[PDB]
Scaffold this active site. Sequence first.
Site, PDB file in Angstrom:
ATOM      1  N   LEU A  38      22.806 -69.349   1.822  1.00  0.00           N
ATOM      2  CA  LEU A  38      22.387 -68.090   2.396  1.00  0.00           C
ATOM      3  C   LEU A  38      22.571 -66.905   1.457  1.00  0.00           C
ATOM      4  O   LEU A  38      22.098 -65.785   1.743  1.00  0.00           O
ATOM      5  CB  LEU A  38      23.065 -67.843   3.794  1.00  0.00           C
ATOM      6  CG  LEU A  38      22.921 -69.023   4.779  1.00  0.00           C
ATOM      7  CD1 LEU A  38      23.730 -68.767   6.031  1.00  0.00           C
ATOM      8  CD2 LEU A  38      21.450 -69.264   5.105  1.00  0.00           C
ATOM      9  N   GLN A  66      26.448 -67.543  16.102  1.00  0.00           N
ATOM     10  CA  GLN A  66      25.491 -66.399  16.054  1.00  0.00           C
ATOM     11  C   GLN A  66      25.449 -65.604  17.381  1.00  0.00           C
ATOM     12  O   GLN A  66      25.388 -66.188  18.479  1.00  0.00           O
ATOM     13  CB  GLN A  66      24.077 -66.941  15.831  1.00  0.00           C
ATOM     14  CG  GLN A  66      23.137 -65.923  15.289  1.00  0.00           C
ATOM     15  CD  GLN A  66      21.808 -66.528  14.948  1.00  0.00           C
ATOM     16  OE1 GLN A  66      21.622 -67.777  14.958  1.00  0.00           O
ATOM     17  NE2 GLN A  66      20.824 -65.648  14.880  1.00  0.00           N
ATOM     18  N   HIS A  70      20.894 -63.230   3.030  1.00  0.00           N
ATOM     19  CA  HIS A  70      21.639 -62.686   4.180  1.00  0.00           C
ATOM     20  C   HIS A  70      22.763 -61.814   3.667  1.00  0.00           C
ATOM     21  O   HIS A  70      23.470 -62.228   2.737  1.00  0.00           O
ATOM     22  CB  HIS A  70      22.201 -63.797   5.121  1.00  0.00           C
ATOM     23  CG  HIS A  70      21.147 -64.608   5.816  1.00  0.00           C
ATOM     24  ND1 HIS A  70      20.693 -64.296   7.082  1.00  0.00           N
ATOM     25  CD2 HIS A  70      20.453 -65.693   5.434  1.00  0.00           C
ATOM     26  CE1 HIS A  70      19.724 -65.126   7.419  1.00  0.00           C
ATOM     27  NE2 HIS A  70      19.532 -65.978   6.431  1.00  0.00           N
ATOM     28  N   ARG A 125      23.818 -68.907  20.078  1.00  0.00           N
ATOM     29  CA  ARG A 125      23.671 -70.109  19.272  1.00  0.00           C
ATOM     30  C   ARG A 125      24.905 -70.381  18.442  1.00  0.00           C
ATOM     31  O   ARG A 125      25.246 -69.608  17.616  1.00  0.00           O
ATOM     32  CB  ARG A 125      22.457 -69.971  18.337  1.00  0.00           C
ATOM     33  CG  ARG A 125      22.280 -71.127  17.354  1.00  0.00           C
ATOM     34  CD  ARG A 125      20.829 -71.356  16.969  1.00  0.00           C
ATOM     35  NE  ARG A 125      20.326 -70.339  16.070  1.00  0.00           N
ATOM     36  CZ  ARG A 125      19.203 -70.428  15.379  1.00  0.00           C
ATOM     37  NH1 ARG A 125      18.440 -71.498  15.463  1.00  0.00           N
ATOM     38  NH2 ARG A 125      18.842 -69.435  14.612  1.00  0.00           N
ATOM     39  N   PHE A 137      29.016 -75.116  11.198  1.00  0.00           N
ATOM     40  CA  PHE A 137      28.089 -74.227  10.533  1.00  0.00           C
ATOM     41  C   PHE A 137      28.424 -72.763  10.810  1.00  0.00           C
ATOM     42  O   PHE A 137      28.984 -72.057   9.930  1.00  0.00           O
ATOM     43  CB  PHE A 137      26.629 -74.637  10.859  1.00  0.00           C
ATOM     44  CG  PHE A 137      25.546 -73.778  10.236  1.00  0.00           C
ATOM     45  CD1 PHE A 137      25.753 -72.920   9.144  1.00  0.00           C
ATOM     46  CD2 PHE A 137      24.220 -73.861  10.748  1.00  0.00           C
ATOM     47  CE1 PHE A 137      24.729 -72.170   8.598  1.00  0.00           C
ATOM     48  CE2 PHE A 137      23.202 -73.037  10.227  1.00  0.00           C
ATOM     49  CZ  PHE A 137      23.455 -72.187   9.141  1.00  0.00           C
ATOM     50  N   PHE A 180      26.184 -63.342  12.289  1.00  0.00           N
ATOM     51  CA  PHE A 180      26.827 -64.646  12.442  1.00  0.00           C
ATOM     52  C   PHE A 180      28.167 -64.659  11.768  1.00  0.00           C
ATOM     53  O   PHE A 180      28.452 -63.940  10.812  1.00  0.00           O
ATOM     54  CB  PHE A 180      25.944 -65.852  11.938  1.00  0.00           C
ATOM     55  CG  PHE A 180      25.536 -65.780  10.483  1.00  0.00           C
ATOM     56  CD1 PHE A 180      24.498 -64.963  10.048  1.00  0.00           C
ATOM     57  CD2 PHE A 180      26.154 -66.610   9.551  1.00  0.00           C
ATOM     58  CE1 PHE A 180      24.102 -64.951   8.715  1.00  0.00           C
ATOM     59  CE2 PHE A 180      25.748 -66.615   8.250  1.00  0.00           C
ATOM     60  CZ  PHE A 180      24.784 -65.749   7.800  1.00  0.00           C
ATOM     61  N   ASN A 205      18.691 -62.573  10.179  1.00  0.00           N
ATOM     62  CA  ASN A 205      17.405 -61.809   9.991  1.00  0.00           C
ATOM     63  C   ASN A 205      16.195 -62.691  10.148  1.00  0.00           C
ATOM     64  O   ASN A 205      16.317 -63.890  10.388  1.00  0.00           O
ATOM     65  CB  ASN A 205      17.400 -61.090   8.603  1.00  0.00           C
ATOM     66  CG  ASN A 205      17.421 -62.062   7.479  1.00  0.00           C
ATOM     67  OD1 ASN A 205      16.607 -62.948   7.422  1.00  0.00           O
ATOM     68  ND2 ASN A 205      18.319 -61.886   6.559  1.00  0.00           N
TER      69      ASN A 205
END
Length: 165
Positions: A122, A63, A126, A55, A60, A113, A102
């Site tokens: 985040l 991942q 994260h 992904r 952004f 990521f 997660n």
Amino acid sequence: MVNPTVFFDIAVDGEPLGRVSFELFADKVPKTAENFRALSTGEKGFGYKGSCFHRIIPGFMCQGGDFTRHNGTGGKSIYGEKFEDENFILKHTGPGILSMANAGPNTNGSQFFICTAKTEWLDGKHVVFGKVKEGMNIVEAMERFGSRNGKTSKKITIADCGQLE
Ligand SMILES: Cn1nnc(CN(Cc2ccc(N)cc2)C(=O)NCC(=O)N2CCC[C@@H]2c2ccccc2Br)n1
């Protein structure tokens, strides 16, 4: 005394693209950094070599790390299927940041990521554990194979990986 460096050699539909290397913040998040180091070398008999970035959302993040199921439902750490959020000391300050994906509190495995933007929302949920050292341009080249819903237009793989020095 000095933080370890790891590399990924990235390929796109099997064609070499280039090398990304990462500083791992072992000085601040030793357990999380060690997981990623070890998965990078393959020294436990499993890890990132041959896995994909499932992904990629341009503007952004990218991942990956799901080496068991190849689609964001899998992976495992070197400590067990899951491990704790070690700390939230380090923040998502901008492009290049390396952080754990997660599915809830204390559910880290192998999925990670790489940020291509500042992602401050985040922070505190994260675990940030490293950053890109060289080859941010190779991350930018990868990013161009992503799309709005994260589906990649070409297959983006970690062809090789390990530890530098
Ligand atoms: C449909 N899908 N693709 N990949 C995933 C994986 N995933 C859940 C997951 C993560 C780690 C383990 N060990 C198991 C499961 C996930 O992306 N969780 C959210 C997450 O960690 N992140 C990190 C950055 C991108 C993503 C995210 C976080 C917050 C908002 C949106 C988004 Br997208 N699920």
